[PDB]
Design a binder for this molecule. Structure first.
Ligand code: CL
Length: 548
């Protein structure tokens, strides 16, 4: 009875829109398996400890992303940075849900629009494998009925020459975005059915696996998935992608975990939560990759194209793959409806989590907003609506790619690294362990403390540095962005990165007293500031810095 509720809760917590939409094309962009090795390694080493850290911080301090830094006042800039990262992601995260709503609306028919050519949106080059009996060597084969539908009857991308000619918003995606935004606002306006939003993703995935294994070309897709290329592992692109996707799927670095845990019971078991979430995430990622590559092998067989060229490597890979596998099921209309309802539910839940992450973080800092949740929610929602309108234009896919590349890459990694440093070195891993013992009754093991203090920061710093010194100019399949687009993306990435040093400078300059007094007040918890006048600061001793 109640244990069923516990199950539903944990499984729903372990699923995300990321695992269903983003992981497929990141695994396919790399070799598959070659992406799972770095994925699992980083998952354990950095993701599990930092997920546990964020949950414990939120639970113990009962604060959001920003105000939780009363323990170490100099990192409120890190809190602000994660809130800004969360605000940036929503702009394009809400457009991926409008796509799901459009596909659901298009799915209410006995002849799915992506099954064959002959529609108003099909180009003369549309090739239906059933209606007819090569393809360069390194193009992405955009002439299939499903790709044609996605890019011309939904995106209308054929009316944009690049990110310099995005055009005007598409009026159908406009209505879908309006509906999504209204639903979010009315689901968030009055405070902080989910049963069927945690079981459906696994039923869909199970059906996908079982059915796609038994397809004419799935064997070669599985063989490609299970073949590992280490010369790919020697490039750091896979490592950067794996780290970013880990922090996307687990929800760390967005302020969502801290805000959600601020409402948890003080005695809730965070260690069990972290273990279960990480295990489910790993298993789900592996199964999702398996099914995705089985479908990719099927399409490679059907279209007589190389597996590396069958589908796009960016956002929309799912909107091509999943319709193409649904069209081969019996009663495909029912399956399309079910699948796109599943996508809508998952996306709405993820957007609600992120928007709540932002609203709670900003309301804890300013009480006026906390007293006017309706108006503040409306403001956040309307800003998101406009900055997402930017992404539903004819060239909106280019803007979405730029955002999905730059709004949480080196920025989210840097923010999580700063969180770990502030919690482990300046606040004290020993103090954090004592707090965890006070909450849950047992102290964290040596592995957790080592990961929090040395291992996870080291790997995070390595990946952050490598993502900067080894930066590949942005591209969308065969399209190469103009040089200024990369500068715009890097400015977007820095807009949140610079909030940490800027706030450190501001806090230092605001505090009164001599240099040492200002430093002590900036590194001491606000509830122990009376000790500063007594010249009793742990951080000014070697024992604090040599503590694990
Ligand atoms: Cl994932």
């Amino acid at each position: 009875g109640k244990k069923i509720d516990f199950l539903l809760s944990v499984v729903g917590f372990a699923v995300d829109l990321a695992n269903v939409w983003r992981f497929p094309y990141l695994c396919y962009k790399n070799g598959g398996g070659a992406f799972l090795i770095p994925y699992t390694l980083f998952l354990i080493i950095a993701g599990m400890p930092l997920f546990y850290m964020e949950l414990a911080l939120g639970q113990y301090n009962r604060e959001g992303a920003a105000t939780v830094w009363k323990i170490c006042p100099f990192f409120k800039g890190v809190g602000y940075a994660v809130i800004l990262i969360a605000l940036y992601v929503g702009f394009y995260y809400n457009v991926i849900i409008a796509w799901s709503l459009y596909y659901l609306f298009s799915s209410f028919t006995l002849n799915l629009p992506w099954t064959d050519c002959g529609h108003t949106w099909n180009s003369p080059n549309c090739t239906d494998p059933k209606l007819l009996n090569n393809h360069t060597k390194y193009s992405k084969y955009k002439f299939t009925p499903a790709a044609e539908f996605y890019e011309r009857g939904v995106l209308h991308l054929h009316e944009s020459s690049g990110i310099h000619d995005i055009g005007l918003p598409q009026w159908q995606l406009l209505l879908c975005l309006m509906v999504v935004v209204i639903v979010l606002y009315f689901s968030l306006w009055k405070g902080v059915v989910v049963w069927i939003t945690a079981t459906l993703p696994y039923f869909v995935l199970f059906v996908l696996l079982v059915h796609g294994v038994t397809l004419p070309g799935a064997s070669n897709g599985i063989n490609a998935y299970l073949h590992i290329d280490f010369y790919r592992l020697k490039e750091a692109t896979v490592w950067i992608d794996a780290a970013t996707q880990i922090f996307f799927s687990l929800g760390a670095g967005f302020g969502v975990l801290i805000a959600f845990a601020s409402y948890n019971k003080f005695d809730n078991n965070c260690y069990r939560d972290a273990l279960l979430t990480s295990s489910i995430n790993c298993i789900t990622s592996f199964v999702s990759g398996f099914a995705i590559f089985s479908i990719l092998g099927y399409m490679a067989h059907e279209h007589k194209v190389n597996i590396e060229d069958v589908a796009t490597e960016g956002a929309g890979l799912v909107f091509i793959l999943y319709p193409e596998a649904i069209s081969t099921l019996s009663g495909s209309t029912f399956w399309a409806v079910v699948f796109f309802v599943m996508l809508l539910a998952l996306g709405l839940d993820s957007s609600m989590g992120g928007m709540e992450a932002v609203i709670t973080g900003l309301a804890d800092d300013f009480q006026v907003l906390k007293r006017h949740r309706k108006l503040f929610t409306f403001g956040v929602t309307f800003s998101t609506f406009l900055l997402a309108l930017f992404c539903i234009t004819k060239g909106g896919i280019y803007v979405l790619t730029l955002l999905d590349t730059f709004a949480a890459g080196t920025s989210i990694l840097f923010a999580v690294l700063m969180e770990a440093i502030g919690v482990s070195w300046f606040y004290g891993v020993d103090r954090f362990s004592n707090d965890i013992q006070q909450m849950m009754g047992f102290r964290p093991g040596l592995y957790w403390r080592l990961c929090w203090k040395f291992v996870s920061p080291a790997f995070l710093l390595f990946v952050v540095v490598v993502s900067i010194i080894n930066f590949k100019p942005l591209t969308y399949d065969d399209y190469i962005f103009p040089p200024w687009a990369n500068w715009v993306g890097w400015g977007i990435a820095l807009s949140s990165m610079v909030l940490v040093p800027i706030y450190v400078i501001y806090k230092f300059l605001s505090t009164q007293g001599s240099l040492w007094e200002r430093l002590a007040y900036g590194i001491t918890p606000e509830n122990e500031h009376h000790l500063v006048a007594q010249r009793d600061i742990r951080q000014f001793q070697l024992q604090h810095w040599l503590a694990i």
